[PDB]
Amino acid sequence: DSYVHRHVVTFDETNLVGNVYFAHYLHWQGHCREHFLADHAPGVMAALADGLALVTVDCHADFYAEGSAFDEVEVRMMLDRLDGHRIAMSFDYVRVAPGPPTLLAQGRQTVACMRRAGHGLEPVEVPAELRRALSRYAVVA
Amino acid sequence: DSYVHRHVVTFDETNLVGNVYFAHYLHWQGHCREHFLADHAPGVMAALADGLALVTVDCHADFYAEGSAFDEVEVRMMLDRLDGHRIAMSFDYVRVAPGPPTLLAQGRQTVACMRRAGHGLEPVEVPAELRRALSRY
Amino acid sequence: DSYVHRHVVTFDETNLVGNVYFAHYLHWQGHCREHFLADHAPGVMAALADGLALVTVDCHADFYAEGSAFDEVEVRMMLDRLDGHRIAMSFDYVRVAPGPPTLLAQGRQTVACMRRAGHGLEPVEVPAELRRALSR
Amino acid sequence: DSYVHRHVVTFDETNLVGNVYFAHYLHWQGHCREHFLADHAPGVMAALADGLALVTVDCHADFYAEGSAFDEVEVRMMLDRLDGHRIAMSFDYVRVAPGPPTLLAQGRQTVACMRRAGHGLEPVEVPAELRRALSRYAVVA
Numbered sequence: 001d002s003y004v005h006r007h008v009v010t011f012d013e014t015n016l017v018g019n020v021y022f023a024h025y026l027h028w029q030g031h032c033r034e035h036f037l038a039d040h041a042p043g044v045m046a047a048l049a050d051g052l053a054l055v056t057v058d059c060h061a062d063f064y065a066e067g068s069a070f071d072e073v074e075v076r077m078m079l080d081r082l083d084g085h086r087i088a089m090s091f092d093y094v095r096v097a098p099g100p101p102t103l104l105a106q107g108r109q110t111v112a113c114m115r116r117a118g119h120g121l122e123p124v125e126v127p128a129e130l131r132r133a134l135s136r137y138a139v140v141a
Numbered sequence: 142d143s144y145v146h147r148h149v150v151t152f153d154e155t156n157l158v159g160n161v162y163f164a165h166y167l168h169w170q171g172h173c174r175e176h177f178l179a180d181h182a183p184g185v186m187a188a189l190a191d192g193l194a195l196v197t198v199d200c201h202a203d204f205y206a207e208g209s210a211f212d213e214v215e216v217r218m219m220l221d222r223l224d225g226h227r228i229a230m231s232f233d234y235v236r237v238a239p240g241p242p243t244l245l246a247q248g249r250q251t252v253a254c255m256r257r258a259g260h261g262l263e264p265v266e267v268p269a270e271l272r273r274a275l276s277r278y
Numbered sequence: 279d280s281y282v283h284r285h286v287v288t289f290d291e292t293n294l295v296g297n298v299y300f301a302h303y304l305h306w307q308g309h310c311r312e313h314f315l316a317d318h319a320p321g322v323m324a325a326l327a328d329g330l331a332l333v334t335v336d337c338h339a340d341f342y343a344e345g346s347a348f349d350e351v352e353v354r355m356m357l358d359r360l361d362g363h364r365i366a367m368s369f370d371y372v373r374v375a376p377g378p379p380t381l382l383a384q385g386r387q388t389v390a391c392m393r394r395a396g397h398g399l400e401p402v403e404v405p406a407e408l409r410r411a412l413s414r
Numbered sequence: 415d416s417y418v419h420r421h422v423v424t425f426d427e428t429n430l431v432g433n434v435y436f437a438h439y440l441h442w443q444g445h446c447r448e449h450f451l452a453d454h455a456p457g458v459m460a461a462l463a464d465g466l467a468l469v470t471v472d473c474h475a476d477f478y479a480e481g482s483a484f485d486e487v488e489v490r491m492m493l494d495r496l497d498g499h500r501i502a503m504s505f506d507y508v509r510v511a512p513g514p515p516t517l518l519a520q521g522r523q524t525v526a527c528m529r530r531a532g533h534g535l536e537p538v539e540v541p542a543e544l545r546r547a548l549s550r551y552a553v554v555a
Binding site for chain 1: 286288289290308309310313316323336347348
Binding site: 017021022023026027029030053055056058059060061062063104 | 431435436437440441443444467468470471472474475476477486
């Protein structure tokens with residue numbers, strides 16, 4: 001199963017060629033993880049306003065098919081790895097309208113849970129609530 | 142006199158038509174004012190990290206001519222008004238390369254000086270240093 | 279009555295202060311007029327791919343209240359005037375969640391309808407369907 | 415040796431944490447490769463308007479240190495691979511001001527040289543002028 005974040009491609013996201021500028025696909029990963037916390041871990045987003053941080057470690061995208069203005073894109077997110085203070089997510093970018101479902105792109109991202117201090121940013125274990133939520137989207141065999 | 146902030150139009154700023162998306166001209170006003178504080182009021186820029194916030198009250202733009210990817214744009218900024226806690230700026234967007242200088246658009250913006258309160262915000266008086274800098278225009 | 283475009287504020291739209299960076303509110307006007315065409319004038323939408331362009335003449339925004347990441351904003355659009363080849367829209371940005379509904383900001387925009395005819399951009403009138411739809 | 419694109423971090427690039435939003439680092443790769451064409455392959459720049467595109471195959475970024483508004487970042491670009499119709503670049507994002515040069519992130523990107531015939535993207539061999547310009551930034555041992 002995957003977490004489905006819906007996006008409708010806007011004109012400001014299209015380059016003079018007619019297709020979606022590459023960097024936008026990375027913004028959509030951020031939206032997908034944010035919308036996830038809104039829906040399934042609202043205590044966590046919330047804490048972000050009082051201490052906590054989800055730091056991006058790395059991100060990746062691969063681009064297969066051209067998107068266009070007014071395409072309805074699904075950013076489908078799955079859990080790759082949960083190890084201590086770190087979270088590994090993968091993404092699928094499927095155009096669901098107009099026309100047939102088309103895999104436009106695939107992405108990945110790594111996030112570390114941190115907090116702030118005088119000594120510096122310290123690694124702090126994934127909040128219970130977010131662990132509980134992420135688990136539902138793990139890939140089994 | 143005007144403060145000149147240089148911008149080179151990038152592909153992410155151009156839509157399917159081939160011209161600069163309107164919204165971007167408003168971002169550039171932001172870059173121009175920020176670049177101005179870096180150059181002419183650097184104490185104020187440090188003070189925005191601790192207490193002080195510049196809030197946007199309004200902004201306006203009028204569009205005359207189309208930009209294109211790789212155009213060298215001058216965002217030329219002037220001081221209209223200094224009104225207690227408030228600052229009014231205007232803008233000229235001139236393409237200086239390629240081809241002849243062309244006025245693409247003109248703009249305006251209002252910014253208020255605010256120092257964060259118990260739970261909200263309050264109007265402070267334009268910082269001494271920022272007043273000294275707007276005086277040389 | 280007004281046309282409703284829903285937007286949920288994302289973190290990339292917030293600056294270090296904590297509130298929505300001003301320039302994002304102009305993009306939403308763009309999303310609102312585009313979303314309007316998808317819903318209520320899908321022929322015009324298609325005509326854009328071939329000749330027809332909606333050129334922005336001017337835009338304006340006034341900012342009253344601070345937005346925050348995860349706020350559910352309504353960009354409510356109304357028709358001010360329809361003048362030959364031109365269209366004047368206004369906008370209300372209302373936070374509908376969380377908490378009480380709050381007017382964050384007001385907006386306006388003027389758009390000129392334009393299809394090419396020679397070595398240059400030429401004023402064509404408002405398409406029948408778009409003239410019909412703005413009236414609603 | 416590397417191609418140096420300079421970027422000054424603006425407020426619209428910073429989130430409520432105070433640091434640069436991750437996705438902006440991908441936009442800067444775009445600016446770097448574009449600025450490179452302007453400087454060292456201006457014929458390729460002109461051919462873009464008429465029937466040449468550079469389609470992004472993939473991109474990647476790793477993040478090591480936090481940027482801040484007004485930091486002067488160098489987006490330094492090197493040529494990894496030139497393989498027929500393809501180009502692989504790597505990127506070092508170095509803060510040069512304020513304080514000691516600091517590696518903030520590292521990125522990679524793959525481009526493909528594509529031309530339109532009717533309504534079909536065909537792979538075109540890397541143009542002579544860009545092939546020669548990129549070559550000056552190749553890795554020496």
